[PDB]
Amino acid sequence: SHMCDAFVGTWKLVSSENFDDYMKEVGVGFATRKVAGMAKPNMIISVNGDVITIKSESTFKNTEISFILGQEFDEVTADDRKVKSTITLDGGVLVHVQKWDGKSTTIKRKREDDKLVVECVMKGVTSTRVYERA
Ligand SMILES: CCOC(=O)c1c(NC(=O)[C@H]2CCCC[C@H]2C(=O)O)sc(C(N)=O)c1C
């Protein structure tokens, strides 16, 4: 159904801005911030029917989520939070909200030119992570 076609593929992280501050706000501790911050994950996005799968593979961690748009699921994040996640499409942007411990963060993923741009926000702190095709 050509849902998410432009996101599908294998992507490599090529830049990150303000990620340490984002992680601090989320509650990531020092050692994990330092080692996570070094990671340059491959993000692999695929679609099969209504099910979207997003894998992230790096030297630090491999993560995988599979979901249906609009349908909440329990996610264990790379930093080991146990969150309730809901991912929707809003105007062509994948919007991923994570809830845990009365906290919330929002991750937006967009296609912009040949890049996939990820913006993540925790209170007033935004980080931008830019991926290119692998
Ligand atoms: C919050 C701490 O995150 C990490 O350290 C981190 C990942 N975070 C993400 O996949 C999301 C982070 C929030 C934005 C969306 C995502 C993005 O990075 O693009 S994957 C990963 C790995 N495979 O090793 C690590 C180490």
Author numbering: -2 to 131
From the paper:
Compounds containing stereocenters of unknown geometry are registered as a mixture in our database, whereas if their chirality is known they are registered as individual enantiomers/diastereomers. A gray zone contains compounds that are known to be pure enantiomers but for which the chirality of their stereocenters is not yet defined, for example in separated racemic mixtures for which it is not known which part is (S) and which part is (R). In such cases, the electron density is usually the deciding factor for final assignment of the correct enantiomer.
